[PDB]
Short mmCIF file of C-alpha atoms in Angstrom, two decimals:
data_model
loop_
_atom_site.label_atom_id
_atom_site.label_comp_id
_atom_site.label_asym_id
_atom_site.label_seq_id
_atom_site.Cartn_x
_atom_site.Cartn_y
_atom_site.Cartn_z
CA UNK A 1 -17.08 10.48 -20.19
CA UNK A 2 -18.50 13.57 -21.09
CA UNK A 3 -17.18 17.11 -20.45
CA UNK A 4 -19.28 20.35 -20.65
CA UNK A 5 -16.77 23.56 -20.57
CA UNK A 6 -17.76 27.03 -19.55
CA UNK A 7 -15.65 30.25 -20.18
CA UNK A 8 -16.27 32.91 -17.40
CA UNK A 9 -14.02 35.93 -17.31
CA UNK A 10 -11.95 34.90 -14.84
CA UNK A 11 -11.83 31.18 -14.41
CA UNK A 12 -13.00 28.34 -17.25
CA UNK A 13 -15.10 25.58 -15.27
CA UNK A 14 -14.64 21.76 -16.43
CA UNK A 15 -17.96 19.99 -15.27
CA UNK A 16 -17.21 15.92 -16.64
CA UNK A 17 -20.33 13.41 -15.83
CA UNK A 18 -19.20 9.37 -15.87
CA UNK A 19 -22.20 7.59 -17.92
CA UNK A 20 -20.31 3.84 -17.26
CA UNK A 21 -18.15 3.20 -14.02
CA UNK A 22 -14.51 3.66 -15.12
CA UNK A 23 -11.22 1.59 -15.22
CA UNK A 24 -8.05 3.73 -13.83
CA UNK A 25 -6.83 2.50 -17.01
CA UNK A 26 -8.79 5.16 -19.31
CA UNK A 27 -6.80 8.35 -17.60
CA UNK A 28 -4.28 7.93 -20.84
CA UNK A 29 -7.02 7.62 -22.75
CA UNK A 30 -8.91 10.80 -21.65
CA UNK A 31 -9.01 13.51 -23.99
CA UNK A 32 -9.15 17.02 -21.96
CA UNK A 33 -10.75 19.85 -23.02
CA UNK A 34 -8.63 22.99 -24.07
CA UNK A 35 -8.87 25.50 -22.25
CA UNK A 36 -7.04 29.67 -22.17
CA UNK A 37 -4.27 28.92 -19.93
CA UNK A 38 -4.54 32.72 -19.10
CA UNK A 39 -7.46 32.27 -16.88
CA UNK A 40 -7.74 29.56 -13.67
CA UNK A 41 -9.79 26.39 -13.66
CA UNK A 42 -12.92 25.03 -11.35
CA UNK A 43 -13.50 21.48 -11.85
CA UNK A 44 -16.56 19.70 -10.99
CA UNK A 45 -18.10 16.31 -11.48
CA UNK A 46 -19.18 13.11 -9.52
CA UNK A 47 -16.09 10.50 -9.95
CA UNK A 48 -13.41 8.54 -8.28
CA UNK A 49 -11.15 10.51 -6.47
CA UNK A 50 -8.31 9.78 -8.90
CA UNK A 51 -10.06 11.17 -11.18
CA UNK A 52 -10.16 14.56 -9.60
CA UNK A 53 -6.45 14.51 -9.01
CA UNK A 54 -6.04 13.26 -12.33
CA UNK A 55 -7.78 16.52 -14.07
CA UNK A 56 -6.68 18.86 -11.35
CA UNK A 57 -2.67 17.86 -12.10
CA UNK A 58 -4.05 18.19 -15.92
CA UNK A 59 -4.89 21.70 -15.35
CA UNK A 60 -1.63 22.72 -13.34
CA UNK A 61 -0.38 25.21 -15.92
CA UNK A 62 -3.30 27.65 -15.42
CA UNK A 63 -2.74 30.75 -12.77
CA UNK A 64 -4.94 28.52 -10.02
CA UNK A 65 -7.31 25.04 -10.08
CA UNK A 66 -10.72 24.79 -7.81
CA UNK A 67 -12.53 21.81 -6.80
CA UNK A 68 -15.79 22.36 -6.48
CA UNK A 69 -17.35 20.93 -3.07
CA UNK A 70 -21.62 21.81 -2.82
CA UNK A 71 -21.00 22.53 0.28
CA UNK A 72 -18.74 25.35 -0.06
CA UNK A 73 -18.10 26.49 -3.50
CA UNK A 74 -14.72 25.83 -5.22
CA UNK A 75 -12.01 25.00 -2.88
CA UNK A 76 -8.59 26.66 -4.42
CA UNK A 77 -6.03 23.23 -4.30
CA UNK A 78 -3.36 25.16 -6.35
CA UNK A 79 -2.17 28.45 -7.32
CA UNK A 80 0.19 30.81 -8.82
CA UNK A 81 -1.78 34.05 -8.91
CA UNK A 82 -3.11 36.52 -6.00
CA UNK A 83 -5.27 33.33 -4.72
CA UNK A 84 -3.68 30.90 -2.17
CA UNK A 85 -4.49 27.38 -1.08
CA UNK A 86 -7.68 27.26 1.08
CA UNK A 87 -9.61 30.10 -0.58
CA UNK A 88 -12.78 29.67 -1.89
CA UNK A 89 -14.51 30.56 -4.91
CA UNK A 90 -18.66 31.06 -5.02
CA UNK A 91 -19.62 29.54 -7.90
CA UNK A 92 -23.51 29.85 -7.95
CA UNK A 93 -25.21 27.50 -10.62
CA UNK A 94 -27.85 29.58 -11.75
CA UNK A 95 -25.31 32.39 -12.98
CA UNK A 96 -22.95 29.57 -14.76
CA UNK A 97 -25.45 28.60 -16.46
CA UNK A 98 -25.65 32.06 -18.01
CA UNK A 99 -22.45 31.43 -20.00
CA UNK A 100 -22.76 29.30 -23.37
CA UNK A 101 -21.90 25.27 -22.74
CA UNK A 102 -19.13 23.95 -24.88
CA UNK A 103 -19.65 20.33 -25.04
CA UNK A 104 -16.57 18.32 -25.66
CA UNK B 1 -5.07 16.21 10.91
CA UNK B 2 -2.29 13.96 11.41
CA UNK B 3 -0.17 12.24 9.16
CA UNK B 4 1.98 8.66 9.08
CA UNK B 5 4.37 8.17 6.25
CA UNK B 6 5.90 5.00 5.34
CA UNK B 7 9.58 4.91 3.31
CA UNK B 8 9.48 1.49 0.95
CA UNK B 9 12.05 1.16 -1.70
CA UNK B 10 10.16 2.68 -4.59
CA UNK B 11 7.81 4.85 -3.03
CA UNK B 12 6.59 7.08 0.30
CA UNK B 13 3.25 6.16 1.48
CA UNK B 14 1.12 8.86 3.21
CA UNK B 15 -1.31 8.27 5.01
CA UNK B 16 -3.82 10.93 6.81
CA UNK B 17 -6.09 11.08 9.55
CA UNK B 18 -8.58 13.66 10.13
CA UNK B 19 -9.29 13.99 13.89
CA UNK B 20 -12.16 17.24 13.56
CA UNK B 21 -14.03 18.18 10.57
CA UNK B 22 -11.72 20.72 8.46
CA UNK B 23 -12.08 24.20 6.67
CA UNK B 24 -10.71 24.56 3.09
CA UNK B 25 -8.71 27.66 5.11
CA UNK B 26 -6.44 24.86 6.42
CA UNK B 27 -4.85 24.21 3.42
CA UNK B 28 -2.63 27.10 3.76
CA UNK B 29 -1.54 26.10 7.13
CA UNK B 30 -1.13 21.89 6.58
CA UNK B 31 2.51 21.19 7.13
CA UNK B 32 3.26 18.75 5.22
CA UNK B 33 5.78 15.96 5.32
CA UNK B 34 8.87 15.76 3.56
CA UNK B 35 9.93 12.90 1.70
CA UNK B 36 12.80 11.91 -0.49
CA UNK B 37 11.74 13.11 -3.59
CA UNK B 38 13.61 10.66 -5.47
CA UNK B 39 10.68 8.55 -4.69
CA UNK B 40 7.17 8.53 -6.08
CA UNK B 41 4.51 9.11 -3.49
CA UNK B 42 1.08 7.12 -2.54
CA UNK B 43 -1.46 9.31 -0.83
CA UNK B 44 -3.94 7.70 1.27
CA UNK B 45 -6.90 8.92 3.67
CA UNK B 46 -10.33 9.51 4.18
CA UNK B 47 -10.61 13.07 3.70
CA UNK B 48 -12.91 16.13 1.15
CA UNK B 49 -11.92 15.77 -2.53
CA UNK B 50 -10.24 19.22 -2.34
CA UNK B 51 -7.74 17.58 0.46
CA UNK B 52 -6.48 14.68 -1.79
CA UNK B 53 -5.96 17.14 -4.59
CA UNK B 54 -4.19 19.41 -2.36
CA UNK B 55 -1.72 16.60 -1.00
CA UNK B 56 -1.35 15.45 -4.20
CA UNK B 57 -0.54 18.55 -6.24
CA UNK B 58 2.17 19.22 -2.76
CA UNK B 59 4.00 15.96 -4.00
CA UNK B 60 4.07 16.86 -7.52
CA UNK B 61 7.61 17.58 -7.62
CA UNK B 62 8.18 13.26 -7.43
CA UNK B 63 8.29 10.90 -9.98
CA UNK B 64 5.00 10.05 -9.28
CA UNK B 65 2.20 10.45 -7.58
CA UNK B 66 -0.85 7.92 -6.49
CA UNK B 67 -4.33 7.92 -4.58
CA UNK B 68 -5.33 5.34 -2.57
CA UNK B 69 -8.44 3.14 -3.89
CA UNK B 70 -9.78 0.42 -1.61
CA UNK B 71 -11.02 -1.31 -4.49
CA UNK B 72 -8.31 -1.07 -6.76
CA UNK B 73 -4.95 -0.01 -5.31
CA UNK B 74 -3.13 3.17 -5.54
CA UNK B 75 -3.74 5.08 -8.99
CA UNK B 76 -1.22 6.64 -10.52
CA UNK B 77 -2.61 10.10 -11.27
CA UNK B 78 0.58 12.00 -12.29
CA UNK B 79 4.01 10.52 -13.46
CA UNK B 80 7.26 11.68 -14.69
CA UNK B 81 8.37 8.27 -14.52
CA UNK B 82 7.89 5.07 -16.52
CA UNK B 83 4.98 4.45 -15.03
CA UNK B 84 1.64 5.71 -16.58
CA UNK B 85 -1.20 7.45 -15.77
CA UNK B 86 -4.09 5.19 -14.99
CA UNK B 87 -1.15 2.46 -13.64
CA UNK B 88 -1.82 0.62 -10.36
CA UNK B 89 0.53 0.16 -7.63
CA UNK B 90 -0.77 -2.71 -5.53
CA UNK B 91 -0.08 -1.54 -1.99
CA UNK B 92 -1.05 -4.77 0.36
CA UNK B 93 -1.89 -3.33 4.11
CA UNK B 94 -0.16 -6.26 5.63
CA UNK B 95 2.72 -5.96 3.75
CA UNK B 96 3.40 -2.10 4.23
CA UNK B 97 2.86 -2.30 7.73
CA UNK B 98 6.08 -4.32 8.07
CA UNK B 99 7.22 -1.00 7.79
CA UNK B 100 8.72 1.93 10.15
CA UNK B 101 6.27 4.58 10.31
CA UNK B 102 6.95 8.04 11.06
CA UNK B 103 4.19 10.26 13.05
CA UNK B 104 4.31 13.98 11.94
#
């Protein structure tokens, strides 16, 4: 698994890509990127859903975690700042991809 | 959505049904089921990524919490228990269904 990390001013997003299918078993394994608690976390990837959940629980200490759906944006799952549960964040690709790529 | 939850000895299964096609907005509003949270939890449903991680960040407080996989089982995503992350609970339908379950 690889992870590419991107610090905006408000949120840090964790896009992961799988390059082999994946055991459950390599979730102790996984070595998450670092990230400034101080700020909320959007993760997106392709991947099992456990996976998701996995990374999303990872990230619990941060003011709020977003899943990112294409359909939508990044769907708010968890907070403890001014967003709630159910909001959406617009995460448009072409302005991410503005900010340098930390590859971990 | 609706939900049926099933009390075994060592864990609450979950299970949700989504009867019309859902807004992340919804999240706020889900009301979720209690369970004894001396229990770990197994989450299970056909649902949007950002649903599962919902549900399973609402359970956190448990000593665990795992995501149904057809293929594999429930994986253990989070655990403050002696189970690890990446662990499989092997949840046989037949055998859970012996079960009461409770409609909320």
């Amino acid at each position: 698994m690889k992870f590419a990390v991107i610090d905006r001013k408000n949120f840090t997003l964790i896009h992961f890509e799988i390059e082999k299918p994946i055991k459950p078993e390599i979730l102790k394994e996984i070595e998450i990127p670092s990230v400034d608690t101080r700020k909320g976390v959007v993760i997106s990837g392709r991947g099992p859903i456990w996976l998701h959940c996995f990374l999303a629980h990872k990230y619990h200490h941060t003011p709020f975690v977003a899943v990112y759906d294409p359909r939508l944006g990044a769907v708010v799952v968890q907070s403890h700042s001014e967003l709630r549960e159910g909001d959406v964040i617009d995460v448009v690709v072409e302005e991410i991809l503005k900010g340098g790529v930390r590859h971990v």
